[PDB]
């Protein structure tokens, strides 16, 4: 055991060197749906290597005034590869997610990112009684931007956001974060185009900064999400 880590799933393999540890959400590892908990009666398809692999999303630049970003799962991966194709051809789905956040900075840089996986994260907009629209909520892999990271865009507090599974990327000692998430639903399966179980939110708690030669350093943040134990039921045409 050390600060080094290798995550090898399917054809994908991520090696990280300045890591901390692996955070398993609620101390659990994603698993396939057992018979006693199954509801659908037809066999689910279980494509292991084609879907249970790392998909790298498009990066965001960390700015000094960055508020934070959020990606809703499985919406971020609903448009990508075999996972997206199986989501489109199937009604019901079930999978856990292994999320890995990359952020590289020099030893002269300072900054802290909180990477929190919020389950069942209902976004509440502020100063309006109208609920959030489909365009604002379902954003795909392109992600979302926090209006009020202080309130988590929920009316809650960012201070109390540590009940949810979480990682810190502190530039002194970390450059990568890893969180493992099992199935999060009151039902064994659901509909992907209309519901999201997890929301991965990266919030800069401490702004990125440098001294006299490291200001305005273009530092990207990368998200890599790997589905695990993906099952699909209800084969039909694409929608």
């Amino acid at each position: 055991s050390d600060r080094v880590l290798q995550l090898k799933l399917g054809n994908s393999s991520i090696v990280t060197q300045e890591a901390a540890n692996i955070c398993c959400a609620y101390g659990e590892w994603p698993t396939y749906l057992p018979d006693n908990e199954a509801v659908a009666i037809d066999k689910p398809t279980q494509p292991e290597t084609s879907t249970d692999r790392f998909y790298t999303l498009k990066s965001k630049k960390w700015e000094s005034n960055s508020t934070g970003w959020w990606w809703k799962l499985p919406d971020a991966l609903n448009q990508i590869g075999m996972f997206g194709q199986n989501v489109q051809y199937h009604y019901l789905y079930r999978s856990g997610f292994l999320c890995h956040v990359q952020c590289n900075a020099t030893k002269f840089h300072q900054g802290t990112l909180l990477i929190v996986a919020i389950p069942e994260h209902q976004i509440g907009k502020k100063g309006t009684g109208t609920s959030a629209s489909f365009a604002e909520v379902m954003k795909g892999a392109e992600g979302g931007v926090f209006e009020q990271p202080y309130l988590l865009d929920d009316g809650t507090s960012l201070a109390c956001a540590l009940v949810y599974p979480h990682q810190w990327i502190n530039l002194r000692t970390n450059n990568s974060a890893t969180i493992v998430l099992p199935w999060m639903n009151s039902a064994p399966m659901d509909f992907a185009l209309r519901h999201n179980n997890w929301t991965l939110a990266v919030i800069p708690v401490c702004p990125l900064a440098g001294g006299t030669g490291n200001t305005n350093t273009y530092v990207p943040i990368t998200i890599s999400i790997a589905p695990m134990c993906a099952e699909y039921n209800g084969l039909r045409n694409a929608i």
Partner: protein, 194 residues
Amino acid sequence: ESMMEINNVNDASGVERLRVQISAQSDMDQLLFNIPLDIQLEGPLRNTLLGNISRYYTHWSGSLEMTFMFCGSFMTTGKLIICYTPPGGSSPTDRMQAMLATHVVWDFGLQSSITIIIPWISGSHYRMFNTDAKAINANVGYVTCFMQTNLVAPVGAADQCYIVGMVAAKKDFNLRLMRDSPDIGQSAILPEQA
């Protein structure tokens, strides 16, 4: 078993609504008829034993079965494909999209009836008989019938035949939260007169 009103259009009076037109086609891959699976709302499946009894309840679960009986002449041959499509999108109009969902190919012969199982494909354990048939908790799916090859009958036989559709539940069917049905109503105490 219980027959259902597939021909529920404003042209059929009485028994014509329990029986379905089937035609010798001049084209191929054409859709014959559709069946909504909204037991709660006004559809073919309401006036059925399954439908009438389950409409006393609020939650239902389990797979269903549909039996289609061919009522042509003995010399009439034909091939159909019956497809159940899980919800999420629009109703299939071409066999190209309908074949991808659950389907059974029915060939006429000595056995005059076919059975298709509509399996329990649902995220939740139960489904609601909700007035919003378009919601996730209420929508069940779609049923479509497509001609597979054609309907062929000789000159001596009637060219136009009929299908009778029937629906029932299987051994894994369950109901909960029984309620006053909206089937029958009352405006005053029933007298001993007209």
